[PDB]
Write an enzyme that holds these catalytic residues in place. Structure first.
Site, PDB file in Angstrom:
ATOM      1  CG  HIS A 164      33.138  42.836  33.623  1.00 55.20           C
ATOM      2  ND1 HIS A 164      31.921  42.828  34.241  1.00 55.20           N
ATOM      3  CD2 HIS A 164      33.297  44.070  33.121  1.00 55.20           C
ATOM      4  CE1 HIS A 164      31.369  44.014  34.129  1.00 55.20           C
ATOM      5  NE2 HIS A 164      32.184  44.783  33.449  1.00 55.20           N
ATOM      6  CB  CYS A 187      38.158  42.366  32.626  1.00 49.88           C
ATOM      7  SG  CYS A 187      37.866  40.777  33.442  1.00 49.88           S
TER       8      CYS A 187
END
Lengths: 152, 75
Positions: free
Chosen positions: A91, A13
């Site tokens: 994330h 990510c």
């Protein structure tokens, strides 16, 4: 007999958030790993993101969650890199304006999610911060960082 | 007195502190300037990580000293 448990491969990510906030496939897992060496898998910290942007003459300003969102001069910002919880786990997510329309460029989405104008993304940020465990980084040029013109 | 906080990106932060200031107070002053929340800050002096509840004088951190800042945020 132990417990066999297959796990998904990491999401990368941090790399997708860097590339989406820059609107270009600039960084890779190899570039991230290379950056992570000189600062001493797939779970890159905010130091790597800051160093990645710094190599391009950019910078990540950390937004003070105590400040009102009205003090954020979004037009002066290239884009936003958020750190949101993933139902712990976290994330990285990029928010970015293109032709005046802001998008949530979360790499877990199948398509970008349009947020609208500054008010729309400001409500998005306020709703993301009110949920808790949200950190907002401002991706800006070195000039905007020196001047502090990200702060209205 | 003044102490310096150096980050991994090469930046140097200048702070006004007192020996009786706790490490948490130092992290709060870093938050005022940089926006970094205290619970995301890791301050290291002379190769040791500093404890939030302890004071600056406990670690013998005097004027013009140079603290190192490491950030925790991962994703």
């Amino acid at each position: 007999p132990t417990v066999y448990h297959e796990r998904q491969r990491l999401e990368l990510c941090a790399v997708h958030a860097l590339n989406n906030v820059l609107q270009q496939q600039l960084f890779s897992q190899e570039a991230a790993d290379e950056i992570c060496k000189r600062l001493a898998t797939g779970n890159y910290d905010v130091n790597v993101i800051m160093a990645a942007l710094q190599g391009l003459g950019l910078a990540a300003v950390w937004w003070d969650r105590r400040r009102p969102l009205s003090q954020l001069a979004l037009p002066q910002v290239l884009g936003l890199i958020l750190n949101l919880p993933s139902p712990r786990r976290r994330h990285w997510v990029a928010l970015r304006q293109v032709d005046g329309v802001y998008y949530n460029l979360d790499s877990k989405l199948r398509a970008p999610e349009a947020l609208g104008d500054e008010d729309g993304v400001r409500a998005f940020l306020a709703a993301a911060l009110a949920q808790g465990l949200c950190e907002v980084l401002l991706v800006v040029t070195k000039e905007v960082e020196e001047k502090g013109s990200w702060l209205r | 007195m003044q102490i310096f906080v150096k980050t991994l990106t090469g930046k140097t932060i200048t702070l006004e502190v007192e020996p009786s200031d706790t490490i948490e107070n130092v992290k709060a002053k870093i938050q005022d300037k940089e926006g970094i929340p205290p619970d995301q800050q890791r301050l290291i002096f002379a190769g040791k990580q500093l404890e939030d509840g302890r004071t600056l004088s406990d670690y013998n951190i005097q004027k013009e000293s140079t603290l190192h800042l490491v950030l925790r945020l991962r994703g």
